[PDB]
Amino acid sequence: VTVKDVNQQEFVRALAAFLKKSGKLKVPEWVDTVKLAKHKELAPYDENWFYTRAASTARHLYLRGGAGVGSMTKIYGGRQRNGVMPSHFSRGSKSVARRVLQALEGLKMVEKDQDWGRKLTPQGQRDLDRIAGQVAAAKKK
Template identity: 85%
Template sequence: MPSVTVKDVNQQEFVKALSAFLKKSGKLKVPEWVDTVKLARHKELAPCDDNWFYTRAASTARHLYLRGGVGVGSMIKIYGGRQRNGVCPAHFSVGSRNVARKVLQALEGLKMVEKDPNGGRRLTPQGQRDLDRIAGQVASANKKQRSLQSAM
């Protein structure tokens, strides 16, 4: 059986599975201020999901898998969005630099991410192995679900 990588599975299902894995492991260091922070300057409210830090960490790990050498500056552009200015035209606004930095530091604490000598951060071999293993679990769950649906 050929091995399954992160590129082979649905990104939404993968991020949910990795987020659940990070929460279940209990090793990810979550800052105390996660329940009172906005994720960007252009956001009006804090996130509705209580586990948003795990989801952001999973999404960041997936992005580092696909494209290594990404730093905090790139992450704030990825998680930026449209700032609405009332009757004035909308403009792009970057995401929170502190949130991006703390997520990368938390992933470094798990030994999933390391600093790249060329700048930015990249996945460690252990982190890549973990992500591929979770992608395999997602793919096998999808395969079982498809076989059950075809049997009906």
């Protein structure tokens, strides 16, 4: 495994947990309260979820040259039920993603990229690749 080698769900699942063990990520004190998207029906069932998003994002950046919060809000953004009106896109929160981006920096997984947008760092690039291997290794099944 390149991270590209591992399936997205298991990769994210494994990394997100690894982050949880590490114990040092950092977390707008909120996260209990927050929905994550105006579109959103209820907050996240796994109140633990902050880690999962972080993993998801780290993987998301590693794939691509550089990305920023607006893109993430939309990615997270689902369809919002206008009620009487037909449903439409609504890019998902900007505080969570930003905080995610800021926090990741602390670990050095990602760093400000040139010309705007955060890019993965070689430190992160190394870190993701390492867990990617661990996941591949676990088993067949």
